[PDB]
Amino acid sequence: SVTCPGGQSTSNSQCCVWFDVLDDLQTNFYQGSKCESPVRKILRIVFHDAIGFSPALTAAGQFGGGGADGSIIAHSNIELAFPANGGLTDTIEALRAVGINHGVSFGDLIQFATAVGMSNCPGSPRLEFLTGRSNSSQPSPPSLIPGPGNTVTAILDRMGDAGFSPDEVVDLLAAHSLASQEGLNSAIFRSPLDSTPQVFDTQFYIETLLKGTTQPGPSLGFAEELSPFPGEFRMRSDALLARDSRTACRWQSMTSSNEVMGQRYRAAMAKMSVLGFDRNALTDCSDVIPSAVSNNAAPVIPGGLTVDDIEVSCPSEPFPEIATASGPLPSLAPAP
Numbered sequence: 001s002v003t004c005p006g007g008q009s010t011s012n013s014q015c016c017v018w019f020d021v022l023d024d025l026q027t028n029f030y031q032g033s034k035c036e037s038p039v040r041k042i043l044r045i046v047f048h049d050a051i052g053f054s055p056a057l058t059a060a061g062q063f064g065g066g067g068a069d070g071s072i073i074a075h076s077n078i079e080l081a082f083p084a085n086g087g088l089t090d091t092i093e094a095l096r097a098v099g100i101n102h103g104v105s106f107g108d109l110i111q112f113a114t115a116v117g118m119s120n121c122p123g124s125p126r127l128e129f130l131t132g133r134s135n136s137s138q139p140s141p142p143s144l145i146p147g148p149g150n151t152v153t154a155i156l157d158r159m160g161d162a163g164f165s166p167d168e169v170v171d172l173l174a175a176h177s178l179a180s181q182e183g184l185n186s187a188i189f190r191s192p193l194d195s196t197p198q199v200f201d202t203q204f205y206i207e208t209l210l211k212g213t214t215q216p217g218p219s220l221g222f223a224e225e226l227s228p229f230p231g232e233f234r235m236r237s238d239a240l241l242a243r244d245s246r247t248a249c250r251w252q253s254m255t256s257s258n259e260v261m262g263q264r265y266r267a268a269m270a271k272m273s274v275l276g277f278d279r280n281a282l283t284d285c286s287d288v289i290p291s292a293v294s295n296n297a298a299p300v301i302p303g304g305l306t307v308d309d310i311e312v313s314c315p316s317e318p319f320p321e322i323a324t325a326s327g328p329l330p331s332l333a334p335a336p
């Protein structure tokens, strides 16, 4: 409907300020619309901000957390002391300055920066963006963040409390297709979790299913498992979720279609974005989100490996017929 000062047209007047936030984030935060570390860090922040929400705690008479309320920024002094929130300070401070300079709430800003960041990464879907989340928050309670050494039962329970089914947990983990680690094993800083850290694709689901044969660094870091080729890092929670009977068939169905994986992820992220809010009280400004370049590569089992190297864990569905590559094993360079 409406036309914003820069000539773009939008649904509601409430969407116009986001065209300014968009320009600042692309030019500055993302250094010229790049899909590099700032995007990967923001993806950890949206999850850690939203998951501080617990109905079980509320039911027991305690404060359960406000969900996607920007509390990780507003109360960064409390929240970045939590063990799973390390390596985020510089990104939280960069976001704080954009929030304050544009007059937007921190909770909306984190959702927006996640949608805009993913648009710089090829193969990504257009995430929904809603605005109107209140800027006031209280610190998230401790212990509501799943860690890499937790069992599958522990993760599924914490995530189930928040509101996610076992399938949606698997769906949410498609974000590890654009990921690396920096704090589990600093000796192999920014070692990627899949062979394409800059392409939102299916490779993460394929490669975590491959037999662990390689130790990529001098020693094994915290919650580190043997990976399928040099340079790739494999964390325990991911290796176990790929193989556990409760999640193994969803993990397997995510391996052959980037279109299927992107739509399931988009739906799971839209649910995570309103944890603590009523989406019917928010204004939809999804039209402000730009498209990503398309990924035209087909899913592959890398470096000469075959289906014989996949530890097929879904007893009921045959493993998808995926393409093979004629090559030596790759050695992965650090993610950018």
Ligand code: HEM
Residues within 6 Å of the ligand: 037, 039, 040, 041, 043, 044, 047, 087, 146, 147, 148, 155, 172, 173, 175, 176, 178, 179, 180, 181, 182, 183, 184, 235, 237, 335
């Ligand atoms: C079962 C829950 C999950 C666990 C246990 C988990 C654990 C981890 C760990 C240990 C790292 C490495 C952090 C570091 O040392 O630098 C990581 C990275 C990452 N995770 Fe997850 N994660 C989970 C869910 C998610 C979700 C739901 C998202 C977001 C939608 C997400 C997005 C990312 C991204 C993008 C990175 C890469 C950060 C970077 O490269 O700097 N993770 N995750």
Ligand SMILES: *[C@@H]1O[C@H](CO)[C@@H](O[C@@H]2O[C@H](CO)[C@@H](O)[C@H](O)[C@H]2NC(C)=O)[C@H](O)[C@H]1NC(C)=O
Residues within 6 Å of the ligand: 073, 074, 075, 096, 099, 100, 103, 104, 105, 106, 135, 136
């Ligand atoms: C959202 O609430 C936060 C927390 O009160 C506000 O952040 C402060 O803003 C002032 C002035 O704008 C800054 O000097 C402080 O440094 C900020 N504090 C923190 C912890 O970041 C923020 O301004 C509020 N946003 C809006 C749009 O009202």
Ligand SMILES: [Ca+2]
Residues within 6 Å of the ligand: 048, 049, 050, 051, 052, 065, 066, 067, 068, 069, 070, 071, 072, 140
């Ligand atoms: Ca929060």
Ligand SMILES: [Ca+2]
Residues within 6 Å of the ligand: 176, 177, 178, 194, 195, 196, 197, 198, 199, 200, 201, 202, 203, 204
């Ligand atoms: Ca990838």
Ligand SMILES: [K+]
Residues within 6 Å of the ligand: 259, 260, 263
């Ligand atoms: K679909």
